[PDB]
Structures are given as C-alpha cells and as structure tokens.
C-alpha cells in the first residue's frame, strides 16, 4: 500500500533533507524527524490547497502525477493506524497543535480539512500579549514532553498571526539487553585532537551485525524489545562520508530483510540527544518556502484576515540507556565470549536512524559526535 510507496518516500523526504543539512554545520549533534514532521507538515496540504498542496508536498520527493491525493493522505490514514496498535512492546509518541488568535472569523476549508480522522486541535488564544502566548504554546509540548523539553519558542513577536508546534519524544527499550552493571567507561575519539569520556555500555554476543560494502561500514540492526527497527552505522577508519552518503531506500531495505548472527564483543555508548531545530534552515532551502513567509495566502482556517504560518517549529528528544526489565528481562546466554571479528567498540562518531517495523519510516534520524556540545 504505502509501505511499498509512501514509506520509501518517507525514508526519502527525510533523506533529501540531510544531503543539504550537513552544509550547515559539522560537529552538530543532529536529530531530525522524517515521520513526525511530514505527519505534521503534510497534514497541512490536506486543507491548505492552491500552490502549497504542491510545494509543501512535492518537495518531499512527491510529484502528484503517478501519485494523487489518495494513496498519499490515505497513506498517513493507514500509517497512523497501522503503526499504532496495542502491545507490551513500546511507545514512540508525538503530537502537533495550532494556537491561533482570538478575534477573527474562522471557517474550515483548511482547518476542518485537517480534521478528517486526524482531528487537529484548533484554538484561538490572544497574540496581543506575547507573554502568555509564548507559554501557552510552549506548554503543550509539556503534556507530551511530560518532563523532556518544552521551549519550542521563548520569543514571540506581536506580528505572528499564529504558529505551529510539535512534540516527538521516546524512552529507549531493546531486545539485546546490554549489561546494566558492566559499563566500562572508556574514551571517545572525534577527528584527531580529542579524548571524550563517553559512557560505555557492553556485552558480547552473536549480535545482529553483517558488515556491508557499498558504503564502507559496520551496521548493527539491534532490534528493540518489540517492533522498533534500529539502524546504526559505524565507518571503517575515521572515513565518514560514504555510508551516510550513498543511501536510497532500497539500500537498508536489503539489510532489513536478513537474520544474520555474528560472534563478537559488542561495545556501544550510553547517551541522550536533543536534536531541535527550526523548520527553516533546510525547509525553505530544500523547497518548502512560501506558506510561513509573508508572500502567499495561507488562509483556509477563516475568511477575514491574510494568514500565514508564524513559527512552525518541530521537536525532538531521544534517550539511550537500560530500560525493559518486565518479568523476563534477561540476557539469556551471558557466559559465551565467542568472537571471530569482534570488539565493535563505539568509541567513534557514528550516525543512525530508527525506523519502525509497523510502518517502516525513520521517525528519529540523527547522529552522535561531540557529546559536550549543548
């Protein structure tokens, strides 16, 4: 359906972002969201029609030619249900939210045209006072954040018609339970002049790694204690640009269709990464330009005042650690130090992306380089 058409597209909109995203910085602990962004910025072309329905959609590798409104919006319609199903396996939650202003004449052409099944939440507080406006927006990303991060804005202007926010978050769980006590604090290397004291987890095992070639790296599909599809990517010798470079969907599709075991001493690192960014640097650079700016009717919610999209701003906060001990939280074989080409220590800057076995789209897409940078 979409897990053959719209998911690959989802693994691409995101990818057609990073291939521009590195031109910004370098040491940048990145983390962007392919899923919870498109499923927060594509829901707009639902109601928002005209030129936007193209621009804020086609850029995402789409082309309303051999792929019409159907299978696309129907994509997420499936994509939300057929991802979100009851299981003692995890949670990878997130939400949107549009806090408008009080005193207009709202309609529905684009607002109620975003209601459908994925009923939005359209409000109208007052943007006169920017003090309770920049808090009344920041705290929605507090209900879902529950404690994560909230400041998706701290500065608001009295020229903002209304904006859009999001709040993706996640607690880490996994099938391969690394030791909770056997954590050898070792050092981490960057380019050449560094010695970063990164937390170091470890446990040996016949783990899911089956080293690739046409990119130059050691993957590691460490499945999580349920349906989360983890994909890492450690290079060969401080040679980073290739494994992250050559990457159309088909690539890891092949890696994901395999059950290979390998005798080795795995050694990965403990950490947490807040990959927050304004949806602009690359959005209105890659393609998504108009809507938010002050040069094209982004009306549809009402029929009274020339509307735009103020500060569309997405979220992100991922954690790495040791959570999953429900009654049978075991590392069964913990006495076999078997190993052919082992000691896959993660004392090197890598890059990854965690898909989803249910829908199969890279919801969290980032890396981990210089820890200390904040």
UniProtKB/Swiss-Prot annotation:
One of its GO terms (molecular function) is protease binding. Changing residue 47 to E: In M-Mineral springs; causes reduced AAT secretion. GO terms for biological process: acute-phase response; blood coagulation. The modification Phosphoserine is found at residue 339. The modification S-cysteinyl cysteine is found at residue 212. PROSITE patterns: SERPIN (PS00284). The record marks 338-339 as: Reactive bond. InterPro entries: Serpin_CS, Serpin_dom, Serpin_fam, Serpin_sf, Serpin_sf_1, Serpin_sf_2. Ubiquitous. Expressed in leukocytes and plasma. It comes from the Eukaryota. Changing residue 321 to N: In P-St.Albans/P-Donauwoerth. Glycans are attached at residues 26, 63, 227. Changing residue 136 to E: In L-Frankfurt. It is found in: Secreted; Endoplasmic reticulum. Its main location: secreted. SUPFAM superfamilies: Serpins (SSF56574). GO terms for cellular component: collagen-containing extracellular matrix; COPII-coated ER to Golgi transport vesicle; endoplasmic reticulum; endoplasmic reticulum lumen; endoplasmic reticulum-Golgi intermediate compartment membrane; extracellular exosome; extracellular region; extracellular space. Gene3D superfamilies: Alpha-1-antitrypsin, domain 1, Antithrombin, subunit I, domain 2, Serpins superfamily. N-glycosylated. Differential glycosylation produces a number of isoforms. N-linked glycan at Asn-63 is alternatively di-antennary, tri-antennary or tetra-antennary. The glycan at Asn-26 is di-antennary with trace amounts of tri-antennary. Glycan at Asn-227 is exclusively di-antennary. Structure of glycans at Asn-26 and Asn-227 is Hex5HexNAc4. The structure of the antennae is Neu5Ac(alpha1-6)Gal(beta1-4)GlcNAc attached to the core structure Man(alpha1-6)[Man(alpha1-3)]Man(beta1-4)GlcNAc(beta1-4)GlcNAc. Some antennae are fucosylated, which forms a Lewis-X determinant. (Microbial infection) Proteolytically processed by Staphylococcus aureus seryl, cysteinyl, and metallo-proteases. The keyword Secreted applies. Belongs to the serpin family. The reactive center loop (RCL) extends out from the body of the protein and directs binding to the target protease. The protease cleaves the serpin at the reactive site within the RCL, establishing a covalent linkage between the carboxyl group of the serpin reactive site and the serine hydroxyl of the protease. The resulting inactive serpin-protease complex is highly stable. It is linked to Alpha-1-antitrypsin deficiency: A disorder whose most common manifestation is emphysema, which becomes evident by the third to fourth decade. A less common manifestation of the deficiency is liver disease, which occurs in children and adults, and may result in cirrhosis and liver failure. Environmental factors, particularly cigarette smoking, greatly increase the risk of emphysema at an earlier age. PANTHER family: ALPHA-1-ANTITRYPSIN, SERINE PROTEASE INHIBITOR, SERPIN. This is Alpha-1-antitrypsin. The lineage of its organism: Eukaryota, Metazoa, Chordata, Craniata, Vertebrata.
């Amino acid at each position: 359906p979409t897990f053959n058409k719209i998911t690959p597209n989802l693994a691409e909109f995101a990818f057609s972002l990073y291939r521009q995203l590195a031109h910004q910085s370098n040491s940048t602990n990145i983390l962007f969201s392919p899923v919870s962004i498109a499923a927060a910025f594509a829901m707009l072309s639902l109601g928002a029609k005209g030129d936007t329905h193209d621009e804020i959609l086609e850029g995402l590798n789409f082309n309303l030619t051999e792929i019409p409104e159907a299978q696309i919006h129907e994509g997420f319609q499936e994509l939300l249900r057929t991802l979100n199903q009851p299981d003692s396996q995890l949670q990878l939650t997130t939400g949107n939210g549009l806090f408008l202003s009080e005193g207009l004449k709202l309609v529905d052409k684009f607002l109620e045209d975003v209601k459908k099944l994925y009923h939005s939440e359209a409000f109208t507080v007052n943007f006169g006072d920017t003090e309770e406006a920049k808090k009344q927006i920041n705290d929605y990303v507090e209900k879902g954040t529950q404690g994560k991060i909230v400041d998706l804005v701290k500065e608001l202007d009295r020229d903002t018609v209304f904006a859009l926010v999001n709040y993706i978050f996640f607690k880490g769980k996994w099938e391969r339970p690394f030791e909770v006590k056997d954590t050898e604090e070792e050092d981490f290397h960057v380019d050449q002049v560094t010695t970063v004291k990164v937390p170091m987890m470890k446990r040996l095992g016949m783990f899911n790694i089956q080293h690739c070639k046409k990119l130059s790296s050691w993957v590691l599909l460490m499945k999580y204690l349920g349906n989360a599809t983890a994909i890492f990517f450690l290079p060969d010798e401080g040679k980073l640009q290739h494994l992250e470079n050559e990457l159309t969907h088909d690539i890891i599709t092949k890696f994901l269709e395999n059950e290979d075991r390998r005798s080795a001493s795995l050694h990965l690192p403990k950490l947490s990464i807040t990959g927050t960014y304004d949806l602009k640097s690359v959005l209105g650079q890659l393609g998504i330009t108009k809507v938010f700016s002050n040069g094209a009717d982004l009306s549809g919610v009402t029929e009274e005042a020339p509307l735009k999209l103020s500060k569309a701003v997405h979220k992100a906060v991922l954690t790495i650690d040791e959570k999953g001990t429900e009654a049978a939280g075991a590392m069964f074989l913990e006495a076999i130090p078997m190993s052919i080409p082992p000691e896959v220590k993660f004392n090197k800057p890598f890059v990854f992306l965690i898909i989803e076995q249910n829908t199969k789209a890279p919801l969290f897409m980032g890396r981990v380089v210089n820890p200390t940078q904040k």
